[PDB]
Amino acid sequence: VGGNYNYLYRLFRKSNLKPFERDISTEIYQAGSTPCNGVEGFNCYFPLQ
Amino acid sequence: DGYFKIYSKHTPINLVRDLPQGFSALEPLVDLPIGINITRFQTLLALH
Amino acid sequence: IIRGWIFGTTLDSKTQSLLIVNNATNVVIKVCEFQFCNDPFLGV
């Protein structure tokens, strides 16, 4: 009823994943000139969804 | 293709200066299924 | 002395990395996101 938000999927990445490759790193995605040294906002986003 | 393949061979050499001049094909050992993008590597020795 | 290898990308906790150790009498292949030391060696 809640939605079962336990399952997650990666939405933001810089490269197309190679076959049979895994990306577990949850580092903050950088989508702009901002250094994105943590504390994401207006240019940095959480990679997972 | 996300397959770390390791081959090896052990050869009794006589030289103590450089690699021997000869042919010794390396028979395979392992084809482990890892999915990392290897870019760097390093050796690991023992310090008694 | 030459026992193993550490293949990886950043060789730290941000990315996954392989680790082969030919110690004891069994090889110890293991893939995790280890925080590797600046000067890795086998404690012995």
Ligand SMILES: *[C@@H]1O[C@H](CO)[C@@H](O[C@@H]2O[C@H](CO)[C@@H](O)[C@H](O)[C@H]2NC(C)=O)[C@H](O)[C@H]1NC(C)=O
């Ligand atoms: C393969 O691993 C390499 C090493 O990290 C990745 O190369 C990076 O690619 C990005 C693309 O945006 C560059 O900005 C970085 O500079 C590269 N890192 C380097 C050269 O050390 C590559 O993305 C990985 N590929 C996959 C599919 O995961």
